[PDB]
């Protein structure tokens, strides 16, 4: 073995497993999913003594995995390198948890103003907090000012970025928050109707949206005087948003 030295001895044999996913979604304005996938990786922080042989186990509520690529140490069993390393990458498409639903509403008002209401519905256990929430609502190019009021969170109209940005610190599962805007328009060539960009989101949810759960990670060292019951094991789930757009 050239990835793990011999004679590693740890006093406290601990085990840290980060499962990291980016859920991606393109959704029509009416609620229809137009594309979605999860890209995941499982990184393992190992502090185990000797040259241990591990079996990593999960629900292959189960999951489809459409593709895998493993660390060279795999054969799911492997002798892990010391310290931090990436055990596998994966991608799933079926039965993804879509942690937010974005619900856009746009009312034209003459050729002068744009009345806009956007609703976030959060769709996961209410015992869990989504974090770092941002909702980007694109404003047309010919906007003189925009007025917004928001209940949860704070919202500023970055006019340079040409988009209202709505930021929200926490939000629990099975809830809903909303934001309302009035967009004052300049006059413009009525030749070109406006190419309405989608609404973008970013969030961090404490769960794998692929529904991945770790069943077992078992450690077996035969030579050294410890066993699986001796290893302190820990697992965190972290779902970021990649491209999370609701059309119109």
């Amino acid at each position: 073995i050239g990835w793990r030295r011999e004679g590693i001895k740890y006093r406290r044999n601990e085990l840290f497993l980060d499962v990291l996913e980016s859920v991606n979604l393109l959704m029509s304005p009416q609620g229809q999913v137009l594309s979605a996938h999860v890209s995941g990786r499982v990184v393992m922080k190992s502090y185990l003594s000797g040259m241990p042989e591990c079996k990593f186990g999960m629900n292959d509520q189960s999951i489809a995995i459409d593709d895998c690529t493993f660390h060279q140490c795999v054969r799911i069993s492997f002798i892990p390198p010391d310290g931090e390393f990436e055990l596998m990458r994966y991608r799933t498409t079926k039965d993804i948890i879509l942690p937010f639903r974005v619900i856009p509403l746009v009312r034209e008002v003459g050729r002068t103003k744009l009345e806009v209401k956007v609703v976030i519905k959060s769709n996961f256990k209410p015992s869990l907090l989504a974090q770092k929430i941002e909702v980007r609502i694109p404003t047309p190019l010919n906007t003189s000012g925009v007025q917004v009021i928001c209940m949860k969170g704070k919202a500023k109209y970055k006019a340079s970025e040409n988009a209202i940005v709505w930021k929200i610190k926490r939000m629990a599962g099975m809830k809903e928050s909303q934001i309302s805007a009035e967009i004052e328009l300049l006059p413009t060539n009525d030749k070109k109707k406006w190419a309405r960009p989608p609404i973008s989101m970013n969030f961090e949810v404490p769960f794998a949206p692929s529904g991945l759960k770790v069943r077992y990670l078992k450690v077996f060292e035969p030579k050294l005087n410890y066993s699986d019951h001796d290893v302190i094991k820990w697992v965190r789930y972290i779902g970021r948003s990649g491209i999370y757009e609701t059309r119109c």
């Binding site: 085990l15 840290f16 497993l17 186990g57 770790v214 069943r215 077992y216 990670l217 078992k218 094991k233 820990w234 697992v235 965190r236």
Partner: peptide
Amino acid sequence: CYEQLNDEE
């Protein structure tokens, strides 16, 4: 953060 891992086996 990290939460404990109870054996499901």
